[PDB]
Design a protein around this ligand. Structure first.
Ligand SMILES: [Cl-]
Ligand SMILES: [Cl-]
Ligand SMILES: [Cl-]
Ligand SMILES: [Cl-]
Ligand SMILES: [Cl-]
Ligand SMILES: [Cl-]
Ligand SMILES: [Cl-]
Ligand SMILES: [Cl-]
Ligand SMILES: [Cl-]
Ligand SMILES: [Cl-]
Ligand SMILES: [Cl-]
Ligand SMILES: [Cl-]
Ligand SMILES: [Pt+2]
Ligand SMILES: [Pt+2]
Ligand SMILES: [Pt+2]
Ligand SMILES: [Pt+2]
Lengths: 112, 112
C-alpha cells in the first residue's frame, strides 16, 4: 500500500459501509486481463448511498495483464482502515495496477 | 432484445468501435453474482474516446444472482446493430438483467 492516497475530507459517506465488499470485488474483477489504461468496476448499494470499486491498469503500453488478487485485498483494506472517506493505491510504486474503494452519494442505476 | 432502447443524447461516437469488446465484457462480468440493484462495468480505451459497458441487476429483492452470458451478447449485439450511438436493454421484458454498451467521450482514468 504505497502509494496510498485518501480522498478528501469533504465527502458525506464513510468507507466502513463498503469494506465488507472488498473480498467479493477483488475475487471477481482481478482475474480479468486489462489492456493498458483500461479499468473494471463494480457498484454496490448500501443504506443511504453506494460503494464504487475500481481496478485500473496504469501502464501506458505493454502487454495486457491480469491483476493480483491478494494485492487488491491488501491495498483496499489499507484504504478502508486509514481513509474514512475511501481512497486508492498500489501495492508498491513500481506496480502497474491501481485499486480504489469509494463511498459515494446515489445508487447504481445511473450513468447508463 | 426487448426492451431495447438507443441512446439519443447529443453524443456522436460510433458504437462500431466498441463492438469488438462485447465478447470480452460478457464473458468476464456475467458469471459474477450480483445483489439486487448492484452493477458491474468495464471501460475500454479506443482511438479518440472510450467504451463503457454495464450489467445491472434490476431486481429489487430476492437473492443475489448471476447473468446469462449468451443473453448479454444478444442484447449488446442488437444495440450495436440497431443503435449507432449505443444503447441498452433486456433479453425479454421479464428478465432481471439490463446490459448497456455506451461509446462516450473521455478516458478510463476519471472519477476514482
Ligand atoms: Cl432505474
Ligand atoms: Cl432486435
Ligand atoms: Cl430507442
Ligand atoms: Cl425504454
Ligand atoms: Cl427506462
Ligand atoms: Cl433500469
Ligand atoms: Cl426502477
Ligand atoms: Cl438486431
Ligand atoms: Cl428485430
Ligand atoms: Cl434486426
Ligand atoms: Cl434503461
Ligand atoms: Cl431499455
Ligand atoms: Pt429503458
Ligand atoms: Pt432502436
Ligand atoms: Pt429500473
Ligand atoms: Pt433486430
Amino acid at each position: 500500500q504505497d502509494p496510498l492516497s485518501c480522498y478528501d475530507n469533504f465527502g458525506n459517506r464513510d468507507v466502513a459501509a463498503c469494506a465488507r465488499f472488498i473480498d467479493d470485488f477483488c475475487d471477481t474483477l482481478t482475474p480479468n486481463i486489462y489492456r493498458p489504461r483500461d479499468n473494471g468496476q463494480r457498484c454496490y448499494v448500501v443504506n443511504g448511498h453506494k460503494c464504487d470499486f475500481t481496478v485500473f491498469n496504469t501502464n501506458n503500453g505493454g502487454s495486457p495483464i491480469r491483476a493480483s488478487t491478494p494485492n487488491c485485498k491488501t491495498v483496499l483494506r489499507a484504504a478502508a482502515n486509514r481513509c474514512p472517506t475511501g481512497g486508492r493505491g498500489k501495492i508498491n510504486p513500481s506496480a502497474p495496477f491501481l485499486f480504489a474503494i469509494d463511498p459515494n452519494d446515489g445508487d447504481c442505476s445511473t450513468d447508463f
